[PDB]
Design a protein around this ligand. Structure first.
Ligand SMILES: Nc1ncnc2c1ncn2[C@@H]1O[C@H](COP(=O)(O)OC(=O)[C@@H](N)Cc2c[nH]c3ccccc23)[C@@H](O)[C@H]1O
Ligand SMILES: NC(=O)c1cccc2cn(-c3ccc([C@@H]4CCCNC4)cc3)nc12
Lengths: 323, 333
């Protein structure tokens, strides 16, 4: 099976993240050898509270498990638990141009923020990764990892796989509630633009009722991204939850106002989130379960990572460690 | 417990009398007085592009040379840097508490970048952070180095203090131990330039594993000055070559420069060079005699690397545990 590497930040998922990327990938765990790395060494490139970082790491783990990531099928682990990432990160620094890092898309910036694309390259290249499902803002980073891999391979032979981006997209388009032109993003400042995965039904109703629509008279529930962006987003959200087609929903809401739509959207979304939240809290509060998932995952990751790093170290010419 | 000494040298190029006087001499002298840990920094070496066979051989050459100088594996911890993962682990973590401007301003990065314009790599830029990690892992009190590493060591103090201010008494703040003589041995044909272990012009350098007869010839041809009459006196500005020779002689014999100046009263550069050649040739003969006994004994070198990496890992893992707990990582099971 092809190896898929996905990096997960320990810092709050939305329905866009879930119904888009994550739900798609939960259903492909038997098609691919999927690896999920909670990237706590990348997280510290921004200064943050220590106790919140620890909490956020475990929050992220439980939520990925809640979404359906199966630790017996896929490998899920915490980045800092596998030393090989930092080890390969340093080695690949020596085969990465300073220019390449400076050209990524002043003197008080920390070196971690400057140097993390190399660590990212190491994260991917450690596991002989075939595919990486990056977003558009990390396409440049993946490309650097491909360039590093080909450069190293040209000097020393075929040590690394040249990874590819995962090209086909989720299916669910999920846009911001007060800005339906812009995509719903976990990193949005405006909280009223997003529905978080742990939001309660009262919070969901409030945010959906405030969601922007249009001034059509009569109000008409019809799909039109150009002219009716807000109503179209509500339709896409509802379709993504229920599996009902757009033309089916258009018929279902014939002669109905935007209030009825919003009510059904809120009910559908919160119906979905109640099942995920049940799973989330059950997993998250079970310390022994989470510890065993992390230990098992780190063990699997380390077995593969050590194999690659040993070949890298042999190629460079380092004297092999005496065990 | 004793205060801790940490220092390192690269298995790249060929170690010189400069590397010896600035660093290795002090390493040997500190072994009983302090708890000493000495590293072959192969991960730093590859910031300049190395042939793979040369790197491996040079790592083992350097190890054997530590032993030849008098570094005793019963007294000191001797290990190869890449054998202890914690160096790279703390190296990454400390990037996040190091500013970009602190690294771009470094003299060594600037010198090496001008020299290797075809390979100005991220490792060469990030060099000081990994070096800080090397030191800070072992709760280091003293770092014996030459003058050229003072800037790097100052940053490691800054990183230690900056991290400690946020998180508590995680690191010791290390101090430089730079010698009075031989802290910056200069090139024989260009005494305003530091002696390099990778000089294109071999006549500039006195190599630790070089034929003593070849070394004597190079000392004889070392540039001096046009002073009339020739006078053996210390003056770095106007008599760089003579001063450098006096410095080398002071560091080998343990005699002060004022003492040497008095000794060479009424003498000229023939006496100076004769005395420098005698002392250095004697030193290298003894050193190289010991070197081959160690270097050709693979079982012994293998055992030193095994025991050393074990000792180092015990200390390094303890520090990294505390660093990881402080910054807020979920602790490994
Ligand atoms: N011409 C000279 N005269 C006097 N001393 C000199 C001369 N040239 C070099 N030195 C000193 O030799 C030591 C090793 O130098 P390296 O370039 O191998 O290697 C270096 O310059 C270090 N970055 C290696 C290192 C890596 N991590 C560390 C942690 C602590 C101490 C040292 C290290 C150094 O002490 C250096 O000051
Ligand atoms: N997104 C990925 O699939 C991925 C795979 C492998 C390594 C990765 C590292 N990242 C990543 C690295 C850094 C960041 C940000 C960069 C800006 C500061 N805060 C953290 C976000 C994501 N993403 C990775």
């Amino acid at each position: 099976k092809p190896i898929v590497f996905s990096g997960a930040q320990p810092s709050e998922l939305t329905i866009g993240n879930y119904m888009g990327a994550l739900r798609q990938w939960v259903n492909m765990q038997d098609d691919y050898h999927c690896i999920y790395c909670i990237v706590d060494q990348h997280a510290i490139t921004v200064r943050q509270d220590a106790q919140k970082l620890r909490k956020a790491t475990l929050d992220t783990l439980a939520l990925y498990l809640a979404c359906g990531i199966d630790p017996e099928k896929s490998t899920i682990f915490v980045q800092s638990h596998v030393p090989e990432h930092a080890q390969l990160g340093w080695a690949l620094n020596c085969y990465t141009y300073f220019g390449e890092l400076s050209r990524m898309t002043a003197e008080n910036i920390n070196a971690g923020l400057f140097d993390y694309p190399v660590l990212m390259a190491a994260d991917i290249l450690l596991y002989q990764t075939n595919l990486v499902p990056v977003g558009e803002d990390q396409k440049q980073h993946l490309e650097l990892s491909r360039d590093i891999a080909q450069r190293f391979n040209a000097l020393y032979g075929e040590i690394f796989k040249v990874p590819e981006p995962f090209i086909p997209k989720s299916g669910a388009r999920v846009m911001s509630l007060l800005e339906p032109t812009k995509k719903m993003s976990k990193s949005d400042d405006n909280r009223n633009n997003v529905i978080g995965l742990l939001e309660d039904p009262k919070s969901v109703v409030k945010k959906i009722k405030r969601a922007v629509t249009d001034s059509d008279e009569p109000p008409v529930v019809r799909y039109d991204v150009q002219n009716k962006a807000g109503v179209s987003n509500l339709l896409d959200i509802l379709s993504a939850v229920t599996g009902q087609s757009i033309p089916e929903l258009e018929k279902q809401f014939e002669g109905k106002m935007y209030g009825h739509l919003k009510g059904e959207v809120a009910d559908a979304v919160s119906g979905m989130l109640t099942e995920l939240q049940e799973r989330y809290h059950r997993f998250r509060n079970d310390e022994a379960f989470l510890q065993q998932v992390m230990k098992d995952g780190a063990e699997k990751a380390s077995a593969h990572a050590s194999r690659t790093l040993k070949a890298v170290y042999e190629a460079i010419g380092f004297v092999a460690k005496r065990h």
